[PDB]
Write a protein that binds this ligand. Structure first.
Ligand SMILES: *C(=O)/C=C/N[C@@H](C(=O)O)[C@](C)(Cn1ccnn1)[SH](=O)=O
Length: 263
C-alpha cells in the first residue's frame, strides 16, 4: 500500500540509512509493494534459513539425515552460541543444529551446518542451481556480518531473497515434509520479538528470521498472514545507520504496523 511506502521512506530519514522492502503474494509470486528491490544489503543471520533449505534438499536426496549426531570441540565455538556451548561432550543432531541456527540464531550451529554441505561456496552453488544468481555467501560466522559499504560478499537483494524464500516454502524444490519442517523452525523463531512480531495481532501466522550486523545492519524475512495461515512474504533490510539497536527495532516494527493496518 502507498502508506507503507511513506513509512519505509520515513524509516530512511530516522535511521539516516538505506532501507530495502518487498511484499510478495505467497501463492502467485506477484510483487505487491517494493522499495530499492534490486539494491544489495548484507543478509546477516537471515542466510541461516537458506542454509537449512540446502540441508533439507540433501535429506530429500538421501545425502543427509535429521538424526545424524555431530561432535565438535571448544575451538569450534564462536560468539553467541547459547545452544552449541552446552553440548561439547554429547554433540547435536542435524535436526537440533537447524533448530538452534533458525530459532535461537546460534552462530556455531550455522558454521557446523556449513561444514556439512562444503562451506559458503556450496550454499552459493545450491542458490545458483534453483535460479537465484544474486544471493551469495562468501564467509563464515562471524566475519559474514562485516557489512563493508559496497562489498557484495554475503549480500542479497530484497526481490531475490523474497523469491528464494517463496520457492523454499511453497515450490516442488523441497518435499512436503521438508517445506513443513523449514516453516516450523521459522514459526518457533525466539529472537525476533521486537520486529514484525510486536505489530502482529493474535490470530495471525508469522514464520520469520531476523538479522543484525556491523554498521547498523538489521533485517527480517517472513511468511505471515491472517486467520492462522501465511499468505505473504515480507523482506526488510537496512545497513549504514548509527542509530541504537532499540531505534532500528522500532522502525522495522512501525513498517510492520503499517503493513498490517493496510493489509
Ligand atoms: C545474526 O544476525 C547474527 C549476527 N551476529 C552478530 C550480531 O548478532 O550482532 C554478532 C553476534 C555480533 N558480535 C560480533 C562480536 N561480538 N558480537 S557476530 O556473529 O557478528
Amino acid at each position: 500500500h502507498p502508506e507503507t511506502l511513506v513509512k519505509v521512506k520515513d524509516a530512511e530519514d530516522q535511521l539516516g540509512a538505506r532501507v530495502g522492502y518487498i511484499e510478495l503474494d505467497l501463492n502467485s509470486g506477484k510483487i505487491l509493494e517494493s522499495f530499492r528491490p534490486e539494491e544489495r544489503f548484507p543478509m546477516m543471520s537471515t542466510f541461516k534459513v537458506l542454509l537449512c533449505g540446502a540441508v533439507l534438499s540433501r535429506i530429500d536426496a538421501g545425502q543427509e539425515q535429521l538424526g545424524r549426531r555431530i561432535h565438535y570441540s571448544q575451538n569450534d565455538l564462536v560468539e553467541y552460541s547459547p545452544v552449541t556451548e552446552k553440548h561439547l561432550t554429547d554433540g547435536m543432531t542435524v535436526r537440533e543444529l537447524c533448530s538452534a541456527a533458525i530459532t535461537m540464531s546460534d552462530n556455531t550451529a550455522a558454521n557446523l551446518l556449513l561444514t556439512t554441505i562444503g562451506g559458503p561456496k556450496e550454499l552459493t552453488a545450491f542458490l545458483h542451481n534453483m535460479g537465484d544468481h544474486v544471493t551469495r555467501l562468501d564467509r563464515w560466522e562471524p566475519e559474514l556480518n562485516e557489512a563493508i559499504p559496497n562489498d557484495e560478499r554475503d549480500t542479497t537483494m530484497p526481490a531475490a531473497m523474497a523469491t528464494t524464500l517463496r520457492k523454499l516454502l511453497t515450490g516442488e524444490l523441497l518435499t512436503l515434509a521438508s517445506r513443513q519442517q523449514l516453516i516450523d523452525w521459522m514459526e518457533a523463531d525466539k529472537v525476533a520479538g521486537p520486529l514484525l512480531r510486536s505489530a502482529l495481532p493474535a490470530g495471525w501466522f508469522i514464520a520469520d528470521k531476523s538479522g543484525a550486523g556491523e554498521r547498523g545492519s538489521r533485517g527480517i524475512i517472513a511468511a505471515l498472514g491472517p486467520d492462522g495461515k501465511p499468505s505473504r512474504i515480507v523482506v526488510i533490510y537496512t545497513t549504514g545507520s548509527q542509530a541504537t539497536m532499540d531505534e532500528r527495532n522500532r522502525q522495522i516494527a512501525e513498517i510492520g504496523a503499517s503493513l498490517i493496518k493496510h493489509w
